[PDB]
Paper text:
The universal N6-threonylcarbamoyladenosine (t6A) at position 37 of tRNAs is one of the core post-transcriptional modifications that are needed for promoting translational fidelity. In bacteria, TsaC uses L-threonine, bicarbonate, and ATP to generate an intermediate threonylcarbamoyladenylate (TC-AMP), of which the TC moiety is transferred to N6 atom of tRNA A37 to generate t6A by TsaD with the support of TsaB and TsaE. TsaD and TsaB form a TsaDB dimer to which tRNA and TsaE are competitively bound. In this study, we reconstituted tRNA t6A biosynthesis using TsaC, TsaD, TsaB, and TsaE from Aquifex aeolicus and determined crystal structures of apo-form and ADP-bound form of TsaD2B2 tetramer.
Therefore, we resolved a crystal structure of A. aeolicus TsaD–TsaB in complex with ADP and Fe2+ and a crystal structure of A. aeolicus TsaD–TsaB in complex with Fe2+. In both crystals, the asymmetrical unit contains a single TsaD and TsaB. α2 and α3 from TsaD and α1 and α2 from TsaB interact to form a typical “helical bundle” interacting interface of TsaDB dimer, which conforms to those of E. coli and T. maritima TsaDB dimers. Two TsaDB dimers from symmetrical units further interact and form a TsaD2B2 tetramer. Crystal structures of A. aeolicus and T. maritima TsaD2B2 tetramer exhibit that two β3s of TsaB form two antiparallel β-strands that mainly support the dimerization of TsaDB. The dimerization interface also involves ionic bonds and hydrogen bonds between α3 and α6 (in A. aeolicus TsaD2B2) and ionic bonds between α1s (in T. maritima TsaD2B2). Our structures captured an apo-form of TsaDB and an ADP-bound form of TsaDB, which are perfectly superimposed with an RMSD value of 0.18 Å over 4017 atoms. In our crystal structure of A. aeolicus TsaDB, the helical hairpin α1–α2 (Ser31–Glu50) of TsaD simultaneously contacts the connecting loop of α6 and α7 of TsaD and the C-terminal tail of TsaB, and adopts a conformation that prevents anticodon stem loop of tRNA from docking into the t6A-catalytic site of TsaD. Structural juxtaposition of A. aeolicus TsaB, T. maritima TsaB, and E. coli TsaB exhibit that A. aeolicus TsaB adopts a conserved fold of the N-subdomain and varied fold of the C-subdomain. A. aeolicus TsaB is composed of more long-range unstructured regions (with well-defined electron densities) between β7 and α5. In t6A-catalytic center of A. aeolicus TsaD, we identified an oxidized state of Cys10 (CSO10), which is in range of van der Waals force contact of the TC-moiety of TC-AMP (about 5 Å).
Residue numbers in the entry:
A (entry chain A), B (entry chain A): 1 to 219, 226 to 335
C (entry chain B), D (entry chain B): 1 to 195
Amino acid sequence: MRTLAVETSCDETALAIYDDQKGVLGNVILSQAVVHSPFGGVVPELSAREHTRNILPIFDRLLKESRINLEEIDFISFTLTPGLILSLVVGVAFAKALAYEYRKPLVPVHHLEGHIYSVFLEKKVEYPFLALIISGGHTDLYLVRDFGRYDFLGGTLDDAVGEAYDKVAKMLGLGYPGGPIIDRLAKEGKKLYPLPKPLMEEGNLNFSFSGLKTAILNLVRKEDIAYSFQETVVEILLEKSLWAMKKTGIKRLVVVGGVSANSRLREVFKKASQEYGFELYIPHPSLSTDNALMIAYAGMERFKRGVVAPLDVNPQPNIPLEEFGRIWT
Amino acid sequence: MRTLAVETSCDETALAIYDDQKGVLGNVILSQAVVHSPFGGVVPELSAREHTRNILPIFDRLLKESRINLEEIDFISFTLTPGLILSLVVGVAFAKALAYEYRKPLVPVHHLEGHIYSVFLEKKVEYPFLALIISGGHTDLYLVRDFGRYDFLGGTLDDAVGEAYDKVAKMLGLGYPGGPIIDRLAKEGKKLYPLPKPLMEEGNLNFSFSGLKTAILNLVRKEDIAYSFQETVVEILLEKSLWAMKKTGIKRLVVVGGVSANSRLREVFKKASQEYGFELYIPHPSLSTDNALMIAYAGMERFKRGVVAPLDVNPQPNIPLEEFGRIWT
Amino acid sequence: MKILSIDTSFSFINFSVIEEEKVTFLHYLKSNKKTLELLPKIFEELCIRPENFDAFAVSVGVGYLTSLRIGVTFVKTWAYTLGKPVVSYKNLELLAKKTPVPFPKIPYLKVGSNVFYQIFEESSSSEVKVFKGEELRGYGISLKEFEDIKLGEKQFFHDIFPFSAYGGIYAYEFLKENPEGENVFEIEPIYVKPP
Amino acid sequence: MKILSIDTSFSFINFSVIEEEKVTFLHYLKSNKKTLELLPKIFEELCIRPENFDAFAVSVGVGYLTSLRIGVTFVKTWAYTLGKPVVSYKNLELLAKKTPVPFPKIPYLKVGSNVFYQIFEESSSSEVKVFKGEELRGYGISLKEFEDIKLGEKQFFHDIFPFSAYGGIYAYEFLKENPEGENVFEIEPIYVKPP
Ligand SMILES: [Fe+3]
Ligand SMILES: [Fe+3]
């Protein structure tokens, strides 16, 4: 079977066609980074305008590249929640327009659920497993017992990792995207200055990162700062992940979200899996950032279980992953 | 069970409530004779206006006299056809308004079918039987084999009996209603002049009456004329009825319609049943003219067989009785 | 106050719901179906139920007489049995009152082969007349459906003018000063010609 | 030519079908439901299917921006995939063009806390402005929904003004001279304020 997937939850317009026998049939994305860059962040209204403008041209490219007919699609997958509600409604409108037009079922997907299943595109993972989701406004640990069955283990008490990278780069004056810039300054760092790891109490699976912008101000080459910040963040992520495996007894770890593309993060987690002997799944970088293929995969999982949405299904800015799975599976 | 019946097919607004255990619960009629009298006949547009005006006050009287609640009605019976289409739609609109409002089934009735079943109000008649229907634009013989199963045997090739009475009275100058006036002049007739009986061929069950206004002009007291005309008409009706019993072998005869109230007609048919030994059913005069009780009775018969109309059922000026029975039963 | 307002004057049948002094619902359909094919099935399709309303309004025309008789009979039956107020309204009066052209205003509508019109000045108005070709002083007002028919010195044509919406707003105003509405037994289509 | 015309500018969502140069269908509903709760379920309820139309029309406002983006995205998706023409139309232009009051005409509509208005003379017009209390010369034109807001020297308020009906008639005229319609990729709500 095959699905057209729609993702407009934040600042990327993503459409994809996925076939569970033939694989990727089409995949198109357009980022809005350039337009938000001057504002130092994602501007909600402007993002909504961009989705509205870009979604039809992207679709036209997707149809010309894939050569697929919409009559041959078995169901429309789309991100219902969470995200910017002004952007979410654009993709939902587009998905529901096609579904009604072509008389195809609608299958909703939670965005973080999409990130979990982005690794299944390359390799299926046995249940149960742990998921560290590190992207956007999220730095969460989940125990995934089955599709639709996600137990929340811990999350950030202040800044997510992505927001920490942005706040650090802006702190020492740098481009807005923050991430790439620090990963490149950090590659040039010589000395490793010590920084304090916030929570770090025995068995605590929550995260705190804003207590680093304080010790950072108590300071030297900007390269050593980027290098030292990046090392402390990745170490916090790993230790919390290790504690979660010991607390649960589960030795399969999925690491997903945009920060999972960080080349230093991948080194440290791969090394730890080699030293500790646990299974690690990180997606190809093209799948770490928002895309609709991961939405398509989770949509397949939900459709195959017989779950479709009614025509009047409405997006919401923030249904928790655990609750969404119970509602929709 | 019980029904509210609606009859607006010609120039009488008739509503009734009938209960198949308790009998007549309410019965109200308003004739339009006075208003049509100046025109020498029923004016279609004016009749439609009168139904529209009179149907609500009649209903109010019916509800106050019967004391019944519409919630206690099991289904709405109404005349769908035949008749004046501008008048038919008023009663249908009223019936469908109540049915939709109160969520009650709709059960259509053919007007001549109502006339057949007007005798069942007083006495049930075994099938098969013959029906002579003599009213309005009709002088028909039918073989009724069952409810909804009516075989047309013969009808008028020109004037119906009612129209003949009107044309005769107008010919010799008299009031429009024609019927009552001739039945009263005829009671005063001394000499019986001979008139020619039109069709009267062996085994022919059709009727012709206009060939009498010719021999009438070849003429004396107006009382002897009314008397002679009335005698010839009634004799034609009886002989045709007798031939129909001999051709079919069926010795039960129902005589219905407005002309069945004629006191001379009743004498001659009752006498013939006494002399020939066939069963004769003529309704009380109050049931010979249009009323809704006869519509209610036929509506009971059709409802009990599981037949209801859809909400968009539409009246028509003239579905033949035989075809109506096949369609609706 | 929730009013169900019905217009069966023309082949563009339409009905509105008035609440809080405004149109909250309007359904307008140009159909060649007969009036009794559409009613009351169209109400069932739109989940419109007479017991849900405080009051009813209905057009008495000018319009096609059989379809007016049918609509008026639906509404009188509902209003009388439910004990709810009912307000009649007139199409040519609404067309004049709601169109901001100068006086004199000549609203007109075509029914079969007759063009019915009425003349409105600021403080008086004529009877409904039948047009015979006369030159008329003032501003003709009609519907796009009748754009091929010219009355008066200038003409304004409404692209659309759902009488049930304007009639329902009028009925809402009417019931503020006359909460009992109009006598239900006396509601009749306007008749211009004799039978 | 059969056109499906959609208006998602306000809480009174409405859509029309235009055929033979006239409105043959209009459905108008004032609802507190969210735009995506109503669409496309309301189309399924009324048996409205995009493949049955020759062309589409859609309001680009002024109106509420999220509901405009939603309606425009429905219509662009249908028009593009079916290869059918699409025509955008503007609410304040329709309000001025269809209201026969004298010049200057000041149509206005309220969206959230802003009153948007535009000034129309016989042969020129202004940009869409944001009202700040200024005294204005001419005739204000709005909807009964906004009757409490006064612009200009006199005010006219439409009891009802379903933009999808007027927009569909306009689109019908538009497609006679430009059968290809407007570029589907370029249809966007009107934005008055910056992001
Ligand atoms: Fe994401
Ligand atoms: Fe009769």
